[PDB]
From a paper:
[name] is a member of the Bromodomain and Extraterminal protein family, and has important roles in the expression regulation of oncogenes, as well as the maintenance of genome stability. As a tractable protein target with thousands of reported ligands, we have first screened the PhP library against the first bromodomain of [name] ([name]-BD1). Maximizing the coverage of the experimentally validated set of binding pharmacophores at the fragment level, here we report a pharmacophore-optimized photoaffinity library (PhP) containing 100 fragments with diverse binding pharmacophores, equipped with a diazirine-type photoaffinity tag.
Intact MS screening against [name]-BD1 has identified five fragment hits with >1% target labeling, and we could verify the binding sites of two of them by peptide mapping performed by LC-MS/MS following tryptic digestion. [name]-BD1 was mostly preferred by PhP053 (6.7% vs. <2%). One hit, PhP053 was successfully co-crystallized with the protein, providing further evidence of binding in the primary (AcK) binding site. Other binding modes, including one in a secondary site for PhP053, as well as the AcK site and a third site (residues 156-163) for PhP072 were modeled with induced fit docking, considering the sites of labeling, as verified by peptide mapping. In the newly identified, surface-exposed sites, PhP053 binds via multiple H-bond and π-π contacts to the Y65 and K160 sidechains, while PhP072 occupies a neighboring site by multiple H-bonds towards K160 and E163. In addition, each of the two hits that were further verified by peptide mapping, PhP053 and PhP072, have labeled an alternative binding site in addition to the main one. We should highlight that the orthogonal, secondary binding assays (X-ray crystallography for [name]-BD1, HSQC NMR for KRasG12D and MST for STAT5B-NTD) were carried out without irradiation, verifying the affinity of the fragments towards the respective targets via a non-covalent mechanism of action. For the highly tractable [name]-BD1 target, both libraries provided fragment hits against its primary binding site (nine primary hits for PhABits and five for PhP).
Numbering used by the authors: 42 to 168
The structure:
Amino acid sequence: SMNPPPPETSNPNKPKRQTNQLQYLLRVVLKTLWKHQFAWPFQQPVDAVKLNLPDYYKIIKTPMDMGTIKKRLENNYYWNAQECIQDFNTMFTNCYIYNKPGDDIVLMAEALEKLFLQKINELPTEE
Ligand SMILES: CC1(CCC(=O)NCc2nc3ncccc3[nH]2)N=N1
């Protein structure tokens, strides 16, 4: 039931950019979800020890969370918006895969995902 090292948030040789779409992903998308009453389970990697989920990392092999995403955005880790959008979708999908319909954690993810979809719908044109 040990925890893996977190997903990478720093890699100097990896290519990155600062673009208007990525700026929107930080200023609008992340900020909106981060402040939500249901954000707290998703603000850091799943701690399988603390949450007593010893099978978690036997099932979820591409873990993702908003703490990781926040650091990726703030530390200019990404090349493009698609990469960051994929991280959010991974985070939601992991939750749905591991858990059961109507679990509280799933209801929480669904509420965050609703807002995510609304904001991604208005992702600005690349400048
Ligand atoms: C609501 C609950 C208690 C029950 C619980 O641990 N369920 C499993 C679980 N899946 C998760 N996916 C992402 C983040 C946290 C997660 N926890 N406190 N998390």
